[PDB]
Design a protein around this ligand. Structure first.
Ligand SMILES: [Zn+2]
Ligand SMILES: [Zn+2]
Ligand SMILES: [Zn+2]
Ligand SMILES: [Zn+2]
Lengths: 190, 185, 190, 190
């Protein structure tokens, strides 16, 4: 065990250690803090975990975090039901809404299940989606996903687009990776 | 989503955890691991309900005596004084010590009387101070040395100086000054 | 005195310290390095400093770094002599050339004095520039420049473009500013 | 090459990248800083490099950085001339001098020759040195050096000491390396 001679303490340490990006040292620090220094924070955390976990489930349509079977976005007819924006995570739906650039629909494609692809295929077929927008990070893996979705949905009159790769605000050109600089120059906008 | 933000805020309150990690952790519990998040909640509650200070030394314990104070193969003639129960976790992890510990988080008369009772009842021969190097800690050491002046006790502290395998130009000047004025044989 | 006792050595230390991003500890390290560990590297550096100060000058046409009257890019017949990319500093030309995304010409627009703008205009005319690329840091002061230049050259039948503002390679969506995100979604590619 | 087209400037950039802890990005910044703005600071840095390489020599007595035959420490009559601190690099003297902990003499023992040791013996006898301090990095190889010097100078009635090994001041135990923590428990002191 990660802590010897403390059955319930070591279980808690183990639980923190199985969280993403949490190492052994941090787990022990967190478990000690909640057991000795602020037990109210621990109880607060446990209640919030159970509170958030039984009331927040993925939207049945797109997968966004939601308190109902359909999220606020899917339950909105004053919304372009002809554009579908594919993302890797539900957090990206919050971010893309915060930008105030898009009024269409979303779909969280965090995995390529045969079953999750079929759900995507049924949204495209039932809403008459004419354009897929890939709002993926610009990365080697996102390439693989766009290629896969490009080969899979070859016959559906779909238009495929992806959010632009380029340079953010207030960044000097030398503080940008060369591959983004290349794309920003080759795909300069008028 | 107020329930999700509350979970994120509970994680950001944790020491050395920022908003970005807090958010990732919350998403991790709300999307996939519904069963594992329920077990983490249970494990928090379970550890808070069972963790208590060891009645003898003050360490983290789930019984009346901790496992170190319950181990008969322990060197019961040496006592190591620390200022936090966490320090026992750290010293145990160093694999350098097989004696007993005493958590001296305060300098009471009841705390000191407890210390004396252990020293007398176990015939302690050496008292090791493993405290942070500071003026306040020096004041604690001198106080214990005088209160227990004539018990035929040996007093030692953990070695202070330059760490192993570090070049002098990366050593803090203040620690370098100490290690030169406290040079050893 | 950062190193007491050694007059000539400490002057070398203070020189490194007087460089951008070079602190005291690094200065002593570099000075020590050149003085004891590799005096040939130090000699190489001193002559290379003198050589570059007596040979590198701003180019007559564009203002890039140059050893001659015209840089290697302006003296290159294989370049697209119909495109001109505007930058703020000659360093930006090095950066853009390393991206291997561009074969046109450059012009350093560090000031907006009318003499600098006539040169630019005469270059656009003499070379028959048909596209003017703005590779500036995306900022409010860059938009004012782009608007100012767009007005001054209103009747030269120029295509005006700007390097893409968008999401850089390998960056999560929440890690970019909302404006670049908004533009990355409004100017999508294929 | 790191900068194409301008070879004199690229040689300067490469000269800076040769410096320990200096990368291509910093090298270009430093080179351009010397070719554009501080054209006279760069000429003085070249002069200070050449001047320091011309004048720096090992102290004839101790081996420290010197500009004369004897360094300033070996020439200081207010120095405690009965104590000798052995270091393995002249940089260590700069560090220990800066600690304000010591007013004795130093000896650079970078090698274990017979001439180096005979020099050491000559200094110990000629100054009637009474204490020998070893300020070497804590390692097994350094332990072999101390034992060698302790034996060679067995019957000179010398005091042998080394700088204190242990946990550094003002660090919590959970942030101390476990191997150093193990040592400091074994070599605990009165
Ligand atoms: Zn939805
Ligand atoms: Zn105990
Ligand atoms: Zn030019
Ligand atoms: Zn000397």
């Amino acid at each position: 065990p990660m802590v010897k001679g403390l059955e319930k303490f070591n279980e808690l340490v183990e639980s923190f250690a199985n969280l993403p990006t949490i190492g052994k040292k941090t787990a022990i620090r967190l478990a000690y803090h909640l057991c000795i220094n602020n037990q109210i924070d621990g109880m607060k955390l446990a209640h919030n975990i159970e509170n958030a976990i039984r009331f927040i489930k993925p939207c049945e349509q797109c997968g966004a975090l939601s308190e109902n079977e359909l999220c606020e976005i899917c339950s909105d007819k004053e919304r372009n039901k002809n554009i579908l924006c594919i993302v890797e995570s539900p957090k990206d739906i919050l971010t893309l809404e915060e930008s105030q650039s898009y009024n269409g629909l979303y779909f969280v494609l965090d995995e390529l299940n045969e079953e999750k692809l079929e759900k995507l295929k049924q949204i495209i077929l039932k809403l008459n989606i004419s354009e897929l927008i890939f709002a993926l990070t610009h990365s080697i893996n996102s390439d693989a996903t766009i290629f896969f979705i490009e080969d899979k949905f070859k016959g559906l009159n779909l238009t495929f687009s992806k959010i632009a790769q380029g340079i953010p605000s207030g960044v000097n050109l030398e503080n940008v990776d060369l591959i983004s600089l290349n794309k920003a120059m080759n795909f300069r906008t008028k």
